Amino acid sequence: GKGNSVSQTAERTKYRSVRRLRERFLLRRERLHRVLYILNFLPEHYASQIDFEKRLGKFKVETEPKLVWKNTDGQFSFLFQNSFNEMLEDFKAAGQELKIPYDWTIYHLRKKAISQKIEKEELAWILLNFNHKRGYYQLRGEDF
Amino acid sequence: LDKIAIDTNILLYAYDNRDLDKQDRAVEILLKKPFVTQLVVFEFIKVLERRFKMDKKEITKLTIKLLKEVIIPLSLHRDIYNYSQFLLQRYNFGLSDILVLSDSILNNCTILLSEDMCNGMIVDKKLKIVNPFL
Amino acid sequence: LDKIAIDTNILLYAYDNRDLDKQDRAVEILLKKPFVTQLVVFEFIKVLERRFKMDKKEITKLTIKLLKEVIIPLSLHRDIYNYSQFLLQRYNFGLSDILVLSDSILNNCTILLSEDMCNGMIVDKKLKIVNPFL
Amino acid sequence: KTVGTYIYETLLQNPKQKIKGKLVRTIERKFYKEELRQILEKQKEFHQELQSDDLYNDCIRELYRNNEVHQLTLRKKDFVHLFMEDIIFYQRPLRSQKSSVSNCTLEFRKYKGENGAEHTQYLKAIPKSNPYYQEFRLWQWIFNLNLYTKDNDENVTKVFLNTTQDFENLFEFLNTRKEVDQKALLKHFKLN
Amino acid sequence: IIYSVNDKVEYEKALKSFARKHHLDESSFFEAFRKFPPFKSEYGSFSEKAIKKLLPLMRLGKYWNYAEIDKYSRERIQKIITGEYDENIKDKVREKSVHLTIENDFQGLQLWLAQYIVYGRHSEASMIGKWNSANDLEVFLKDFKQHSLRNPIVEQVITETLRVVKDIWLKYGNGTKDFFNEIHIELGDTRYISKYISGILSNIVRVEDGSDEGVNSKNIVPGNGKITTQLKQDWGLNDVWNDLILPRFERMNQLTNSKDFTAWNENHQKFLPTVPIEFSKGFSKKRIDHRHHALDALVIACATTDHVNLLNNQSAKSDTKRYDLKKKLMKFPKQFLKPWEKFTVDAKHNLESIIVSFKQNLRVINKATNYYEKYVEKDGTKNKERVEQAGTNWAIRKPMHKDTVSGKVDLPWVKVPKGKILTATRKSLDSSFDLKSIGSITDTGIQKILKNYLAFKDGNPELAFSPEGIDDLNKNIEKYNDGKPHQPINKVRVFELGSKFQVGQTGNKKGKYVEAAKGTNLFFAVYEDEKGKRSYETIPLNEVIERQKQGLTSVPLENEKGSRLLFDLSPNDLVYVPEIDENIDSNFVFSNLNKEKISRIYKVEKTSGTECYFVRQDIAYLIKQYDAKTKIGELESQNKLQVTMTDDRIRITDTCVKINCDRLGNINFITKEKIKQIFNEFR
DNA sequence: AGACAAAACG
RNA sequence: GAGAAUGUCGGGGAGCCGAGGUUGUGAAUUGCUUUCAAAAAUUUUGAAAAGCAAUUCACAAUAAGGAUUAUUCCGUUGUGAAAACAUUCAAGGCGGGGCAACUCGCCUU
DNA sequence: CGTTTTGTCTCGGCTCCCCGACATTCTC
Ligand SMILES: [Mg+2]
Ligand SMILES: [Mg+2]
């Protein structure tokens, strides 16, 4: 009587659009994986678990690799120690604390890359992080 | 009041139309949802594929049809072989007929419908053969 | 690690001594207590009574002996006919062989041993036929 | 400063800050694109692999082994364009809806398919912005036009549009405009 | 250029290229045209070709020239001026084209004239059409296109109406031509289906003699609520309906232990159904059943064109001219005469023997086709084209699970009965957290802190767990945690003990536990053992998915104990519950259906575990629903019962027997002819 | 808001 | 009644994108419970492990699943037994458009 | 076991096709 998405077809289309966005994000990630592997940027432990022959760029079945966490004999260790130490130095200068999660180093590298050299694995981490968050954009544009 | 089973010949006479009266009689039985033994089903499949050469697809579809709506298959009883050996000493029939009777009795079937089994004969005081077409 | 079933031909080659090597191979299989389908048992009984004319008593006794000590019968699965119809579209074999494969798969059998079934062929990604005598 | 360093400094000041979903939820893609362009440009000055034309060609073939046209087009670009423009920030355009446009009620076409049948293809309607449709509509309006006098409400027409010259004049006047109204049309004939 | 290149970079490149090919300075040109507003999306009735054809005829003066008229139109012009005879030219033409004596008269032609001249049809004359059998109707149904009407609801209603009309035609007239002498329609927003259905159905009741011409056949007689209600009141069908629905109202009286649901009246000397004012929000005596639709159909069917004319134009301007219709149709103006003597008796006897037929949607898996772009190698060349996906790829036609995903936990301090698991999900901390709820948090330190805070707030969650209260608690978490520090609290994992299944089996999907989606318990299996006792089960949608993928039946034919499957029930299925004394083992004989038998027909509504809820087939809306406060309802808390509504109150699933009904509500039971045909079709 | 699916309460 | 044109209000379908939430992996910090495992006066303090979490960050999945390597996808819609379909669907040619892929029109069967 | 109570994924932008209802002018 009033009308509120009262249609099975509309709901199906909504689900389909969600799935399509997800699939295209995955495709972008896989293409990044392939390009970086050819460029020889990915860390060896990370690259080892990604298929590059049949299921291109995809993770090998029953694996959840992390670019920065290396698993040696069941123990996970952070990959970028010196960058973490630099971030801790900056935090100490800011006078806050000296105990922070390792993964915060991504933002310190993002700041540092603007005017300093960073390791290639760090660049790959940064690029995938950018792929994760793309931002708002309108196709037409037409600056008002 | 009395569990009733059937043999292959009943369903064959149903499937055959050369003999209108006998086909009618057999179809009349089937209106009562009579029980049946899986070996009857398998033998029916064989005869269908050999004498009538009907397609495998059609025979399977009709088997499913009948087993779903008309008749009721009887679960195979694990004591069929031992009982059949028990029946063989006192009874001299075809081992196939003996197996059919063994499974029918093991499922408490009270009446078996068939022609080529010496009608009226009682098997171990538990199941009397009935010849319906007479 | 893999459920194993057999067909009639294995037990026949066991029962036949014209071919010492093949009989030996078939008996060698039987040392592993392979599973089997009731339809295999019935077909074995028929072939025994037709080709070899063996007595009903002796055939029944041997069936009981084998089913008791060597092999393991597989309970008939009520989904045999529907699955067989499902298999018929993708597979063109004898309806008897299709029924045997249907029951074997429905019982989680992982390997079926037989000759006249186009060895090495995989049935619905669940059971690979193995030809042992080669 | 770029979004990354903004987040970094907000994190330095308040180590308890929630970033995802609280500090920055959604912002114009221009911020991300600018930050990534700056980062890639700066790093291209240090890592030789970003300057190896062989590696650029290798990546292009990897992604576009079957599209020689796009390979050739990309061969004139660099890793910066490949990373931002083609891979990360590539947004597909809308699908064409022209196939769903209605069909003409008058003109058909007939053709015989591979099945030995003879079936009809339809002609799509004309976009109303088309000059042809504009002319058609303008002629229709001209023909339907007819004037009346306020005082006695009589069909005063046939005295101002009676010869083909009058109609040619009206059509010439209408073409030059984009819209007509009471005052313009009445003033045309000198009427008020 | 403006219309086809709808893209910024493309548009500027096209602009610059155009400015180069034509010797125009590309300095102010792009500035002028870089901000051209895009054309609005709208299209005309005709294509470009038709407009090009029609313009030459419409133009006049210097813009008009004879040579601009195509060959066929010029031939037609020559024929018309000549006045000769052509089969493609009608008499109405020469009537209209009397003035077009000379070729020069073919100037300034309006749309209709030029249209006819170019194509030879005086605009759209329609085809009227006439169906000669049910084959035409079924073809119409087959070629119907989806999404072709206002909304899915009207489309579904119209399509089902057409299917029902076809079924009636086949059953009662063998689909023979002009079997239906006349068709009447009524609706009682919904107006949309008023005209489309009449237009479609005119093809069945039309006359080809030329008398019946128009948008709708003269035999289609739409009614109005006035005629229907006045016939119903005058004809006493209101009395029949009241009698039919009364027993529900005495049942409600017993249930309430009162007498406010039935009112004595002395003018008729009987009880009339009624509702107390408090339960009179939107009550309507008609909508509480499904048979009033049929009653209205019956009322409409006997209303002749005279009745509708009389009650739509009762204004006569003179008593005499409409006195004839009054006498022919009204007893002496007091009441209308019955269509025949026993109309009330026939209507009662028919209404009491109407089985409601319910449409069912049991789609689970359906084949789907996937075409994707891909480079194919043909004739030594790689070309992009659409390849079809191989293998069997099913599409699941139901939601497999609810959206919320919970994690599995093991709390030593809670007892887990066998066959059940604990699943915890995050929830926001708000005023809805009382001690009972606070007892369902997995973390014990959080339980301690929350209990302490709530106690400090007089044990009032509304005050304790308001946003201000939560802020204060986070500020001072020390005081409620024995002084030991603690991270702020914003969300807490609450656990529930139940039966939740994993979402999948790959990756981390094994760590996701979900509940069955709404309306997915579509199958309810009933087995029976050799003894006779019945076993009941509810098959999960997933198991049904594998079973149907394997080509097997949805419900297993045998349970774990080996009890044979008696049958499976699904929502909207109809079952018959025999009387307590009745022994329906091989009954059948589903033709002698009297009011008593039909009164014992129930419809499945929902299922869970071993529980199956039923509602009598003729019930549409409850007299009163259930409210947690008053705690009364026509069918208790669930608005549906596991047992019969009659005083016997027997378990329906214990003795019910499934039945099968067609679109027209006729039961189907195996018969001699049926069995014969079963393998006659194979013979 | 509605009504299913199942926990929860006796 | 039908047709053409121009406006107002609604409805339907499809498409390109965005932000969270949830579950799980790893980490930083702080807790609750149990057991070990000591010191001390049944009770108090300390190390370790396990269960449950909290705050924050990186990452994985997001209908089970099935394709594919195109900058492609199918999976909650309808019909109904064919487990088959609808929702893409011919050929040419003459042009417009672009860094080109690709896109928009015209003409004849 | 029989009955009642309870919880159930949520929000933003923009474009491009179609249909219908109601008005106005005109024609058949
Ligand atoms: Mg026999
Ligand atoms: Mg064989």
Q: Distance (Å, rounded) from C-alpha E442 to C-alpha E496?
A: 10
Cβ contact E520:E608 at 8 Å:
no
Starting from the CA of residue B9, give the closest ligand: 1
- The length of chain E is 683
**Angle at Cα E611 formed by Cα E608 and Cα E613, nearest 5°?**
95
> Which of B81, B103, B106, B107 to substitute to test the interface with C, most C CBs within 10 Å?
B81
SS3 E103: helix
Backbone angles phi, psi at E110, to 5 degrees: -65, 175
DSSP summary character for residue E61: G
- With CA atoms as reference, the chain B residue closest to C89 would be B57
CA dihedral E389, E393, E395, E396 (to 10 degrees): -150
Out of E42, E61, E110, whose CB is closest to D168? E61
What are the chain E neighbours of D101 within 8 Å (beta carbons)? 43
Residue E371 CA, nucleotide G85 C1', distance (Å): 15
SS3 C122: strand
Strands of E438-538, DSSP E: 491-498, 501-502, 513-514, 524-528, 534-538
As beta bridge partners, residue C128 has C111, C122
Residue E660: closest CA among E366, E365, E360: E360
DSSP summary character for residue E289: B
Whether D38 CB is under 7 Å from strand G: no
Whether E52 CB is under 7 Å from strand G: yes
Q: Is there a contact between E508 and A62 if contact means CB atoms under 8 Å apart?
A: no
Whether E611 CB is under 7 Å from strand H: yes
Contacts of C113 (CB under 8 A, 6+ apart): C4, C5, C6, C7, C10, C29, C34, C129, C130, C131, C132
Q: Distance (Å, rounded) from C-alpha D60 to C-alpha A35?
A: 9
Cβ count within 10 A of residue E249: 20
- Reported resolution, Å: 3.0
Specify the experimental method. Answer: cryo-EM
SS3 E668: strand
- With CA atoms as reference, the chain A residue closest to D55 would be A39
Task: Spell out which chain E residues touch chain C, with contact meaning CB-CB distance below 8 angstroms.
Answer: 550-553, 556-558
DSSP assignment string, A11-77: HHHHHHHHHHHHHHHHHHHHHHHHHHHHHT-S-HHHHTTB--SSSTTPBPSS----SSEEEETTEEE
Out of D7, D55, D63, whose CB is closest to A107? D7
Q: What is the CA radius of gyration of chain E?
A: 37
Cβ count within 10 A of residue E289: 21
For B91-132, where are the alpha helices, taking DSSP H only?
A: 95-106
Ligand 1 ion: nearby residues, β-carbon < 5 Å: B 96
What are the chain E neighbours of D108 within 8 Å (beta carbons)? none
Cβ contact A50:A60 at 8 Å:
yes
DSSP summary character for residue D94: P
- Judging contact as 3 or more Cβ pairs under 8 Å, the answer for D and C is no
What are the chain A neighbours of D4 within 8 Å (beta carbons)? 107, 110-111, 114
Size of interface B-E (CB pairs under 8 A): 36
First-to-last C-alpha distance (Å) of chain B: 23
What are the chain A neighbours of E147 within 8 Å (beta carbons)? 9
Residue E442 CA, nucleotide G40 C1', distance (Å): 34
> Which of A20, A97, A142 to substitute to test the interface with E, most E CBs within 10 Å?
A142
Cβ contact E584:E655 at 8 Å:
yes
Whether E521 CB is under 7 Å from strand F: yes
SS3 E382: strand
Q: Is there a contact between E152 and A64 if contact means CB atoms under 8 Å apart?
A: no
Q: Distance (Å, rounded) from C-alpha A38 to C-alpha A35?
A: 5
Strands of E343-406, DSSP E: 365-367, 371-378, 381-388, 394-396
For E422-540, where are the alpha helices, taking DSSP H only?
A: 435-438, 444-456, 461-464, 467-475
- With CA atoms as reference, the chain B residue closest to C77 would be B75
CA dihedral C63, C66, C68, C74 (to 10 degrees): -80
Whether E110 CB is under 7 Å from strand H: yes
Cβ contact E405:E512 at 8 Å:
yes
Find the C117 Cα to ligand 2 centroid distance in Å. Answer: 8
E58 and D CB contact within 8 Å: yes
Both tokens of E95, joined, read 């009537």
**Angle at Cα E310 formed by Cα E313 and Cα E191, nearest 5°?**
65
Residue E36: closest CA among B74, A142, C60: A142
Find the D62 Cα to ligand 1 centroid distance in Å. Answer: 70
β C111-113/B122-123 pair status = unpaired
Find the D178 Cα to ligand 1 centroid distance in Å. Answer: 96
- In this complex, the nucleotide whose C1' atom is nearest to the CA atom of residue E571 is F4
Q: Distance (Å, rounded) from C-alpha E395 to C-alpha A74?
A: 41
Cβ contact B12:B51 at 8 Å:
no
Residue closest to G73 C1′ by Cα: E372
Cβ contact E38:E6 at 8 Å:
yes
Q: What share of chain A is helix, strand, coil (3-state, %, to 5)?
A: 50, 10, 40
- In this complex, the nucleotide whose C1' atom is nearest to the CA atom of residue D133 is G5
- Judging contact as 3 or more Cβ pairs under 8 Å, the answer for A and E is yes
Both tokens of A55, joined, read 């299921």
DSSP assignment string, E195-206: HHHHHHHTTTS-
Contacts of B105 (CB under 8 A, 6+ apart): B83, B123, B124, B126, B127
Q: Which residue has the tokens 């996937």?
A: E370
Residue E556: closest CA among B78, B76, B35, C77: C77
Residue E218 CA, nucleotide G37 C1', distance (Å): 100
Q: Distance (Å, rounded) from C-alpha B115 to C-alpha E62?
A: 103
Q: Distance (Å, rounded) from C-alpha E121 to C-alpha E304?
A: 38
Q: Which of residues 31-50 of C touch E (CB under 8 A)?
A: none
Residue A49 CA, nucleotide G49 C1', distance (Å): 32
SS3 E35: coil
Backbone angles phi, psi at E43, to 5 degrees: -130, 150
- With CA atoms as reference, the chain E residue closest to C80 would be E552
| Cα maximum dimension of chain E | 113
C-alpha distance from D65 to closest chain A C-alpha (Å):
13
- With CA atoms as reference, the chain C residue closest to B75 would be C76
Whether E13 CB is under 7 Å from strand G: yes
Q: Distance (Å, rounded) from C-alpha E116 to C-alpha E109?
A: 11
- The distance from CA D120 to its chain's CA centroid, rounded to whole angstroms, is 31
Q: Is there a contact between E552 and C79 if contact means CB atoms under 8 Å apart?
A: yes
What are the chain E neighbours of D66 within 8 Å (beta carbons)? 375, 382
- The distance from CA E628 to its chain's CA centroid, rounded to whole angstroms, is 31
